[PDB]
């Protein structure tokens, strides 16, 4: 009837359906050949009995506490970054030890990654090096000197990339738009003549320009069969001659695929002309490179990737491998995009065994405690806000011009 | 007197661009020459009702296009033949041959196109119990007109030469005196490799130093010297411009609404 979170269970109320809904977690938390009651004559049996639930009696009963608590991840206040360009904000973000470096290192440590730290300290998240690599950043423990341990030279690597911005609607501005390397496409001029006694607005001149590309591929197969007969006869005047007859047949099959993409652009002018007058018009089209600056305020999200090998003594992956494999996983720190990359979705769905496909958070709660994981995940998912300035540029764009001239009396 | 003193460094200026003041642009008379007719149309709009009517339309459109494509094909073929000889009644000795064959083929294609179009319409309003004539014409002609404006001037700056053996500012610091070319854009931002300001501002990030090492220049000459030199280099320029426009084989049109005639 009600969802049961395994971290709230207590062997002092528990329905048979509730016990069956969360079965593997309850079986794993009891000793082998242990028998404890549930409710209304039902009891649950431990390992060695294959977790069978059968009618019985017992004085030791599982019991969900009268008033359990909600285990949601808390929401913290936003972190403010000093204003600058996109790269300055990223640099300021990835160099904060107390707000960024420690929580992510602790998250990697809690999930079972190995050697999250440098050689000059004994604690997680200490002696970490930050480097700029391509469009992202890499954070890894310092590897200078020596270390003592099995594969202590294989430090876990944390990578940050794909930064996105959620703008405030009323903050965006942009400056002057400038053009360079202009090339003419086509122009048109014309006149609109009105010789009636009333104003007229039924005029139209339109210029359009299109470009396109296409591709295709084809495969063909076939067969052929032929029979030939040859003989020789003597015919009058022709004398000896050779006569040959051939009959053939063939079959063929073909298959094709393709595609295309078209780009278009048009300009129109529709002037209103006074009575007994005329008006000139002109339309131009160009190709040019465009540039302009901008500024805004937004919220910053990014992708978080953890790379390393999982500890032999225990890790949080749902299959619990024990051969120290190399692992990669990506989280999206921000709005929901997918189930495999959402921490909140996996955390909220930990009461359904069939939804546990990537990480086992109940194992982490057992290992470290509920409040520790809650605070760590709250610090990890803290919102970030900053002011941004930047520059836009693009090559081979379109530029147009439409003009309506002054009227000339007739 | 010097090692390769005859190889002087060359400075080149090109690609001038203008940022106009919005309220300064003007142009003069537009003139046409070498006019060639395309197509014309005339017509009448008749209104025999008791109210004014505006539901009329005449439209003329002209289109041109080009296209291209390329194709590659490959294939294989296998055949087996058997030949024998037999004696058959009346036919006597004869030769019988049987052949069986198979083939395969693969193909790939690419292409593209570009279309140019232009149209003219007239939609007159006709009074009750009257008629109105219309006419539309299309021409090809060469166009010319003068103009003037005020703008800001930007350009591309290119340096060509070889780098000194005793030390240079390139981030790999070569020492074999190679020939070098590099282009700066003196004006609005277009790219990272050609922006002095972006490279100067990002000198505190070692991973962003990919073209020039400005910290080396600051060590060699001092902060204020480089600041003043770069400030003088990037000074804005303004001027007034007059010019002439011309183009060949453009479009020229004409649309007319005539006077009403009572019915």
Swiss-Prot record, chain B:
GO terms for molecular function: identical protein binding; toxin activity. Residues 164-173 are annotated as: Interaction with glycans from host GPI-anchor. Residues 74-106 are annotated as: Part of the transmembrane beta-barrel after proteolytic activation of the toxin and insertion into the host membrane. Changing residue 26 to A: No effect on heptamerization. Keywords: Disulfide bond, Host cell membrane, Host membrane, Membrane, Secreted, Signal, Toxin, Transmembrane, Transmembrane beta strand, Virulence. Proteolytic cleavage and subsequent release of the propeptide trigger a major conformation change, leading to the formation of a heptameric pre-pore that then inserts into the host membrane. Changing residue 29 to A: No effect on heptamerization. Changing residue 148 to A: No effect on heptamerization. GO terms for biological process: symbiont-mediated cytolysis of host cell. It is found in: Secreted; Host cell membrane. GO terms for cellular component: extracellular region; host cell plasma membrane; membrane. The record marks 192, 208 as: Important for heptamerization. Secreted, cytolytic toxin that forms pores in host membranes after proteolytic removal of a C-terminal propeptide, leading to destruction of the membrane permeability barrier and host cell death. The pores are formed by transmembrane beta-strands and are approximately 3 nm in diameter. Belongs to the aerolysin family. The C-terminal propeptide is required for normal protein folding and secretion; it maintains the aerolysin precursor in its soluble form and prevents premature heptamerization and pore formation. Homodimer in solution; homoheptamer in the host membrane. After binding to GPI-anchored proteins in target membranes and proteolytic removal of the C-terminal propeptide, the protein assembles into a heptameric pre-pore complex. A further conformation change leads to insertion into the host membrane. This is Aerolysin. It comes from Aeromonas hydrophila.
């Amino acid at each position: 009837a009600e969802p049961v979170y395994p971290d709230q269970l207590r062997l002092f109320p528990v329905n048979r359906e509730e016990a069956q809904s969360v079965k593997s977690n309850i079986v794993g938390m009891m000793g082998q050949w242990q028998i404890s009651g549930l409710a209304n004559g039902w009891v649950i049996m431990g390992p060695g009995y294959n977790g069978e639930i059968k009618p019985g009696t017992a004085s030791n009963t599982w019991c969900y506490p009268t008033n359990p608590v909600t285990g949601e991840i808390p929401t913290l206040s936003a972190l403010d970054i000093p204003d600058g360009d996109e790269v300055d904000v990223q640099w300021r973000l990835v160099h904060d030890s107390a707000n960024f470096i420690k929580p992510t290192s602790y998250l990697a440590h809690y999930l079972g990654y190995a050697w999250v730290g440098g050689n000059h300290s004994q604690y997680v998240g200490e002696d970490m090096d930050v480097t700029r690599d391509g469009d992202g950043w890499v954070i890894r423990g310092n590897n200078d000197g020596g270390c003592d341990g099995y594969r202590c030279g294989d430090k876990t690597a944390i990578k940050v990339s794909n930064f996105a911005y959620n703008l405030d609607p009323d903050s965006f501005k942009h400056g002057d738009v400038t053009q360079s390397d202009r090339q003419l496409v086509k122009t048109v001029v014309g006149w609109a003549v009105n010789d009636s006694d009333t104003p007229q607005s039924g005029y139209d001149v339109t210029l359009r320009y299109d470009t396109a590309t296409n591709w295709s591929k084809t495969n063909t197969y076939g067969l052929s069969e032929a029979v030939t007969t040859k003989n020789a006869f003597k015919w009058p005047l022709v004398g000896e001659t050779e006569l040959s007859i051939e009959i053939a047949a063939n079959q063929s099959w073909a298959s094709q695929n393709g595609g295309s993409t078209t780009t278009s652009l048009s300009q129109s002018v529709r002037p209103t002309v006074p009575a007994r007058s005329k008006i000139p018009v002109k339309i131009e089209l160009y190709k040019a490179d465009i540039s302009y600056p901008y500024e805004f305020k937004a919220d910053v999200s990014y992708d978080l990737t953890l790379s390393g090998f999982l500890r032999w003594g225990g890790n949080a992956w749902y299959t619990h491998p024990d051969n120290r494999p190399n692992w990669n996983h990506t989280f999206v720190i921000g709005p929901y995009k997918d189930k495999a990359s959402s921490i909140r979705y996996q955390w909220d769905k930990r009461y359904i065994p069939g939804e546990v496909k990537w990480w086992d958070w109940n194992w982490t709660i057992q290992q470290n405690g509920l409040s520790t994981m809650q605070n760590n995940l709250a610090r990890v998912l803290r919102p970030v806000r900053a002011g941004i300035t930047g520059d836009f540029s693009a090559e081979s764009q379109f530029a147009g011009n439409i003009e309506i001239g002054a009227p000339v009396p007739l």
